[PDB]
Structure formats: structure tokens, C-alpha cells
Curated annotation (Swiss-Prot), chain A:
Family, per entry: Belongs to the RNA polymerase alpha chain family.
Encoding gene per record: rpoA
Gene Ontology CC: one annotated term: cytoplasm
Keyword terms: Acetylation, ADP-ribosylation, DNA-directed RNA polymerase, Nucleotidyltransferase, Transcription, Transferase
Mod. after translation: Acetylated on Lys-48 and Lys-49 in the presence of glucose. PatZ controls acetylation of Lys-49 but not of Lys-48. (Microbial infection) ADP-ribosylated on both alpha subunits by the phage T4 protein ModA. ADP-ribosylated on only one of the alpha subunits by the phage T4 protein Alt.
Function, in words: DNA-dependent RNA polymerase (RNAP) catalyzes the transcription of DNA into RNA using the four ribonucleoside triphosphates as substrates. This subunit plays an important role in subunit assembly since its dimerization is the first step in the sequential assembly of subunits to form the holoenzyme.
Protein name: DNA-directed RNA polymerase subunit alpha
Coiled-coil annotated spans: none
Keyword presence, Protease: no
Lineage: Bacteria, Pseudomonadati, Pseudomonadota, Gammaproteobacteria, Enterobacterales
Domain remark in the UniProt entry: The N-terminal domain is essential for RNAP assembly and basal transcription, whereas the C-terminal domain is involved in interaction with transcriptional regulators (such as CRP) and with upstream promoter elements.
Segments of this protein annotated with the region Alpha C-terminal domain (alpha-CTD): 1-73
Residues modified to N6-acetyllysine: K48, K49
Superkingdom of the organism of origin: Bacteria
Gene Ontology biological-process entries: bacterial-type flagellum assembly; bacterial-type flagellum-dependent cell motility; cell motility; cellular response to cell envelope stress; DNA-templated transcription initiation; intracellular iron ion homeostasis; nitrate assimilation; regulation of DNA-templated transcription elongation
Length: 73, 50
């Protein structure tokens, strides 16, 4: 999957979201889409705006949440 | 020098926009960083024949 292995910097997010992802230590979008809404919300310094932006960008780029990855290194 | 007869220096642009030279520089650097961000300008990257 060409868009599963792309770097996380392609998410066109803000500096707050970027440092939140850096703290979460997930550099791949394929590994990042395995999280859930409650887990994303419970993280500190991450409001509804970041969730809305990431959902919009995933929908624009043909991606969604709630899916699982199998045999993903 | 885009879509005009000649280009304007950074100081004249700051004077016209009522914005300090350093703030103009920072806004230009932010714009350049945003353009360097991926998922955009793919044809611009493709415009290299090497």
C-alpha cells in the first residue's frame, strides 16, 4: 500500500499535533491509524480541532479510522 | 517578478504593506516551509529533468 508506508509528515498538521505525534512515537500513518477516538482525546494538549483536521485529511486522502493492520512490521 | 513588469525589494514591499522587514522575512519563511511540506507541488517536483 503506497499510502500506508508514507511518512507521518504528510498529514499537514500543526506544530501542536506534530509534537503530540512525536511524543506518541509513531512516524508512520499506517501505524497511526490504528488508534481510536477515545485514546486520541485522552492524550493531553489534543483538542477536537486536531481530531477534526486529521479526520478531514484522512477522508480527503481515502482513509478512515477503526480499521486494523495485519502482518504490519 | 511574477505577473508584473518588475519585482520589488523586501524593504519596499514591507513599506507598502506596513509590515516590518523581519516580519516580512518570517512570513516568507513560513510560506516557503509550507510549500516544502509534502502532499503538494508534486508537478513542481516533476518539473526537474534530471
Amino acid at each position: 500500500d503506497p499510502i500506508l508506508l508514507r511518512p507521518v509528515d504528510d498529514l499537514e498538521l500543526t506544530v501542536r499535533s506534530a509534537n503530540c505525534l512525536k511524543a506518541e512515537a509513531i512516524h508512520y500513518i499506517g501505524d497511526l491509524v490504528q488508534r481510536t477516538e477515545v485514546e486520541l482525546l485522552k492524550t493531553p494538549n489534543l483538542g477536537k480541532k486536531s481530531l477534526t483536521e486529521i479526520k478531514d485529511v484522512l477522508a480527503s486522502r481515502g482513509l478512515s479510522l477503526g480499521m486494523r493492520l495485519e502482518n504490519w512490521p | 517578478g511574477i505577473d508584473m513588469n518588475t519585482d520589488y525589494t523586501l524593504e519596499e514591499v514591507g513599506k507598502q504593506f506596513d509590515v516590518t522587514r523581519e516580519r516580512i522575512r518570517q512570513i516568507e519563511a513560513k510560506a516557503l516551509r509550507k510549500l516544502r511540506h509534502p502532499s503538494r507541488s508534486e508537478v513542481l517536483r516533476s518539473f526537474l529533468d534530471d
